[PDB]
């Protein structure tokens, strides 16, 4: 014995070693990089908010005003359910599934993921 535990522990140590390598150089030591070809600070994509959602209109409080308020905001739905994408699956696969509430949970997670817009 003592084979498969040793191999899987070596895999987990190699995983955590690659993480501790990749987190110090990019984010902690100098917080980014510098491309030599273009003067653009490269950064990891995980801290960058890839998409952009809809706009929002309003009005200022006092009438007959001329001021412009341009601003930003973040948004998410519930910030705890992850984005393990089931929407990139055709609807013909999971219909020989064992249960019905399993089907309800799949449709609930997919309808959660299709609410990326607000």
């Amino acid at each position: 014995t003592n084979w498969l535990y040793q191999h899987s522990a070596a895999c987990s140590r190699f995983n955590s070693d690659l993480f501790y390598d990749r987190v110090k150089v990019l984010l902690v030591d100098q917080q980014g990089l510098r491309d030599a070809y273009t003067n653009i600070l490269h950064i990891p994509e995980s801290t960058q908010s890839t998409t952009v959602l809809g706009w929002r209109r309003s009005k200022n409080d006092s009438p007959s005003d001329t001021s412009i308020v341009y601003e930003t905001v973040i948004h998410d739905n519930d910030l705890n359910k992850p984005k393990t994408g089931l929407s990139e699956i055709p609807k013909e696969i999971y219909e020989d599934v064992v249960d019905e509430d399993v089907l309800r949970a799949i449709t609930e997670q997919q309808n959660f993921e299709k609410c990326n817009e607000y």
């Binding site: 190699f14 990019l26 980014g32 990089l33 030599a36 003067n39």
Partner: protein, 246 residues
């Protein structure tokens, strides 16, 4: 007034010949760039960064240059010495596409280097024509019968040599090797310049192996060496990638 014009600076060749930036094209707070730090809406503040008054002082003014059912990818190397400085790089090419001629790519690629010598274009285009016409019916194959070869792979980028080992099935067409190199460089945390350079160093090996399946037709599909966990039950993997600085 007081607005910068939107163009007219092309300081690229001086960074090619900067000798601090590790660009392998030519031979002869504490941040560096303000892409996370506001400057309170004075552009003059960007002149405190040492790589940015470099592009205003040493800059120039440029004029803008003006301009099939299955793709076949062919890697093309380029190695030309010219007046002390050299040119060593590599790029893919779509053989089935012909929307751009190698004369036009030579005229574009010579314009960013700021040579425009009118004879580098002919030499580059002749090298591209040669390496395309040498490999016209060796990358158009239809390989079946489950080769499953082992691949050692190396990459040279400025004394930072990449090297790895893996088993490859060159019969299915599901895994793009560009997606493979993307999955490598996402994990090891390298710069984005290793994204082409691995895949351009892989397709060649694919047509090195394909070569032997067609030219000599040596099958030799006999025990791709493994470690008794996956395919061939020895007792019930090979290696892992790394970046070594020599």
């Amino acid at each position: 007034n007081q607005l910068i014009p939107q163009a007219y600076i092309s300081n690229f060749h001086n960074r090619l010949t900067n000798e601090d930036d590790g660009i392998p094209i030519f031979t002869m707070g504490n941040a560096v760039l303000p892409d996370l730090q506001d400057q309170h809406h004075n552009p003059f503040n960007i002149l405190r960064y040492p790589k940015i008054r470099d592009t205003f002082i040493n800059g120039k003014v440029v004029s803008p240059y003006r301009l099939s059912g299955e793709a076949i990818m062919i890697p093309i190397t380029l190695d030309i010495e010219h007046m002390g400085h050299t040119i060593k790089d590599q790029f893919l090419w779509n053989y089935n596409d012909d929307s751009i001629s190698p004369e036009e790519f030579a005229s574009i690629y010579c314009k960013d280097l700021d040579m425009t010598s009118a004879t580098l274009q002919t030499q580059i285009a002749n090298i591209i024509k040669e390496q395309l016409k040498d490999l016209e019916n060796i990358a158009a194959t239809e390989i079946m019968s489950d080769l499953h070869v082992i691949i050692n792979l190396t990459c040279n980028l400025q004394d930072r040599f990449f090297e790895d080992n893996f088993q490859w099935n060159l019969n299915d067409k599901s895994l793009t090797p560009e997606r493979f190199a993307t999955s490598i460089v996402q994990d090891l945390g390298l710069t984005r310049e290793f994204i082409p350079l691995i895949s351009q160093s892989l397709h060649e090996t694919i047509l090195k192996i394909k070569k032997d399946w067609v030219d000599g037709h040596l099958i030799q599909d006999h025990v791709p060496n493994d470690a008794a966990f996956g395919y061939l039950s020895g007792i019930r993997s090979n290696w892992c990638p790394r970046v070594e600085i020599l």
